[PDB]
């Protein structure tokens, strides 16, 4: 598998037309105090096709 191609699975809001946003800050769906790591309903925003 080639993991050098990624897509963002989560963001706090939808992109506007031609908006670009590469910052990998953790997405929180639970009440979790994640502070920059994966956890209970708390997610690293990028995933790969492999």
């Amino acid at each position: 598998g080639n993991y050098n191609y990624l897509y963002r699975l989560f963001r706090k809001s939808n992109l506007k037309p031609f908006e670009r946003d590469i910052s990998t800050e953790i997405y929180q769906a639970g009440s979790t105090p994640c502070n920059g790591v994966k956890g209970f309903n708390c997610y690293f925003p990028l995933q790969s096709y492999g």
Binding site: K16, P17, F18, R20, S23
Partner: protein, 108 residues
């Protein structure tokens, strides 16, 4: 007055714009910056571009991923504040940069 910064956090966590004028050129760049806050000291890589009597006027707006700049220069007799009258800003430049801006700051 020598430039402006635009973005959300302005520093580290996101892309932000830098505009600088040094009288020899205008330098324009877009990075996850941690840059100098005072270009008077002169006396990541997502985009880059280069090119009281004076009232200098500008308009900045971001639409569909393009950052528009318009401008005008005029001499003014009463330097006290923005002089009553009319004069329209011509376009300058239209940067294809795609960034979310919520905040800005001026550079002295």
């Amino acid at each position: 007055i020598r430039g402006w910064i635009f973005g959300t956090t302005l520093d580290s966590k996101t892309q932000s714009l830098l505009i600088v004028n040094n009288a020899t050129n205008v330098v324009i760049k877009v990075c996850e910056f941690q840059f100098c806050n005072d270009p008077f000291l002169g006396v990541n890589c997502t985009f880059e571009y280069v090119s009281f009597k004076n009232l200098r006027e500008f308009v900045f707006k971001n639409i569909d991923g393009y950052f528009k700049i318009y401008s005008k220069h005029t001499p003014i007799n009463l330097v006290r504040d923005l002089p009553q009258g009319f004069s329209a800003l011509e376009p300058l430049v239209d940067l294809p940069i795609g960034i979310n801006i919520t905040r800005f700051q001026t550079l002295l």
